[PDB]
């Protein structure tokens, strides 16, 4: 069965002083087509492209997306890099050059075998109004808010089919 | 030239051409979690809290569906509310949390293991933690028996590391104030 609350806590340790100031900075996902992904994360989800890095020899680019005010992005190159990479909760989208031309290529979202990663999740003020707008924009849904068992929780998909949970923190406790 | 050239990297201009300003309806959206399935929650809780210094900020159990959820984050333990409902609203409104999904029974199934996304079929790559000193953090990780994908001075990007958790998910260990002098 599951762990009890006491057992789970016994498995946890206090933060060592050496981990002071550590922060969970990014989640990296590979994207087939950066044009489609950038449109989705900025226009549909409202994130900001805070940094773009290109690696010509290794043939890939990185796009960092985050919920930051665009006016906070530093102008200087090195300051910009340090600022973007010290923001909490960023998405690092990796574009391996040439995948958009390969009709037989697609990335795996982790929700069918083999499974592992499941989804990223965005907290919103109102799951119903967010999803009504997503519907109007033609967003693909795994789960609309009242579909299935948990009412008021949704799962949408990005252009690669990665699942994105849409949740209201103040309604999670009464889910079902 | 005649044939349509292969797609390559986007120019900075091409990338910005696909970006739209944020609609006001999304102004309070936040990136709250990354969900990873874990084979054994005991090993994962020990790793994330003892090795990486994260805090268990919420635990959820779903008896009928036979799974539990463990939320880990870099939060002060004293900020965790006492009441069950207040605790949930607070934990699920924190930015940058990890949601660990334990499907009951995987820990005793010797034929089972999750996939980390870095071998066929690929998708997800890694999570990343920003630290003040990659070399000192990785020296400690080595002392603790942490599995590495890339030590700080391994490969071309010196000063950047990748470690793995109990399920083999990759975790980047980076110092944001030195990333600009990489390459
Ligand atoms: N073919 C690869 C491409 C992605 C890739 O190679 N990423 C590398 C870290 S980049 C990186 O180090 O990031 C460097 C940087 C980022 C952002 C900035 N900035 O803020 O501007 C500046 C510099 C990597 O994973 N190395 C680990 C290993 O396999 O051992 C893939 O995963 O599909
Ligand atoms: N066998 C599954 C288990 C994990 C699982 O099913 N999680 C579901 C969201 S629970 C959830 O969203 O959350 C319900 C809740 C969480 C936290 C709190 N809280 O903070 O107390 C309260 C309530 C999910 O992925 N649903 C989409 C689908 O499969 O169609 C798997 O993915 O491996
Ligand atoms: Zn990364
Ligand atoms: Zn989730």
Q: Can you tell me the distance from the alpha carbon of B144 to that of B163, in angstroms, rounded to the nearest whole number?
A: 12
Rounded to whole angstroms, the Cα distance separating A33 from A29 reads: 12
Residue A4 token pair: 């009890």
Give me the DSSP letters along A8-26: HHHT--PPPGGGTT-EEEE
Q: Is B9 helix (H, G, I), strand (E, B) or coil?
A: coil
Q: Is A64 exposed, middle or buried (0-12, 13-18, 19+ CB in 10 A)?
A: buried
Distance, CA of A80 to CA of B46 (rounded, Å): 35
CA B180 to ligand 3 center in whole angstroms: 14
Q: How many CB atoms lie within 10 A of CB B114?
A: 21
**DSSP characters over B25-94:** GGTT-EEEEEEEE-S-HHHHHHIIIIIT--EEEEEEEETTTTEEEEEEES--GGGS-SSHHHHHHHHTTS
| Rounded-to-integer distance, Cα B127 and Cα B132, Å | 17
Residue A128 in contact with partner chain B when CB distance is under 8 A: no
Q: Which residue has the tokens 């990223």?
A: A120
CATH assignment of the domain containing B74: 3.10.180.10
Compute the half-sphere exposure of residue B58: CA atoms within 13 Å on the CB side of its CA.
26
Q: Which of B61, B101, B113 to mutate to test the pocket of ligand 2 (most atoms within 8 A of CB)?
A: B101
Decide if B21 and A172 are in contact by the 8 Å CB cutoff.
no
Short-list B148, B95, B31, CA closest to A162: B31
**Residue B89 CB-density burial (10 A; 0-12 exposed, 13-18 middle, 19+ buried):** middle
- Please tell me the total count of domains within chain A: 1
The DSSP annotation for A27-45 comes to EEEE-S-HHHHHHIIIIIT
Q: Within an 8 Å CB–CB cutoff, is residue B158 touching chain A?
A: no
- In chain A, whose CA is at the least distance from the CA of B93? A169
Helix (H) or strand (E) holding A81: helix A77-84
Buried b (16+ CB within 10 A) or exposed e, B43-59: ebbbbbbbbbbbbbbbb
Residue with tokens 């309070």: B28
Q: Which two tokens stand for residue B181?
A: 């002098």
d(CA A20, CA A25): 14
Say what the resolution is, in angstroms.
1.7
In the three-class reduction of DSSP (H, G, I as helix; E, B as strand; rest coil), residue B180 is classed as helix
Report how far residue A47's alpha carbon sits from residue B26's, in angstroms, rounded to the nearest whole number. Answer: 8
d(CA B82, CA B79): 9
**A93 SS3 class:** strand
Q: List the one residue out of A89, A83, A96, A97 whose CA is nearest residue A50.
A: A83
A30 near A161, Cβ under 8 Å? no
Cα(B149)–Cα(B130) distance, integer angstroms: 17
CA distance B129 to B171: 7
A136: burial class by Cβ within 10 Å (0-12, 13-18, 19+)? exposed
* CA–CA distance, A141 with A143 (Å, rounded to integer): 5
Q: Cis peptide before A114, with omega less than 30 degrees from 0?
A: yes
Phi first, then psi: give them for residue A7, nearest 5 degrees. Answer: -65, -45
CA atoms of B55 and A17, how far apart (whole Å): 13
Omega of the bond leading into A23 within 30 degrees of 0 (cis): no
Structural domain of residue A56, as residue ranges?
1-176
């Amino acid at each position: 069965g599951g762990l009890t609350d006491e057992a789970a806590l016994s498995c946890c340790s206090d933060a060592d002083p050496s981990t002071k100031d550590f922060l969970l900075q990014q989640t990296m996902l590979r994207v087939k087509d950066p044009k489609k992904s950038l449109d989705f994360y900025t226009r549909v989800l409202g994130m900001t492209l805070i940094q773009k890095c290109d690696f010509p020899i290794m043939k890939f680019s990185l796009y960092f997306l985050a919920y930051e005010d665009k006016n906070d992005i530093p102008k200087e190159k090195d300051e910009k890099i340090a600022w973007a990479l010290s923001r909490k909760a960023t998405l690092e989208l990796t574009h391996n050059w040439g995948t958009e031309d390969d009709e037989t290529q697609s990335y795996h979202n982790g929700n069918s075998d083999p499974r592992g990663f499941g989804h990223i999740g965005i907290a919103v003020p109102d799951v119903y109004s967010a999803c009504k707008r997503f519907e109007e924009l033609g967003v693909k849904f795994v789960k609309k808010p009242d579909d299935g068992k948990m009412k008021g929780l949704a799962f949408i998909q990005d252009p690669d089919g990665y699942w994105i949970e849409i949740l209201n923190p103040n309604k999670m406790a009464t889910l079902m």
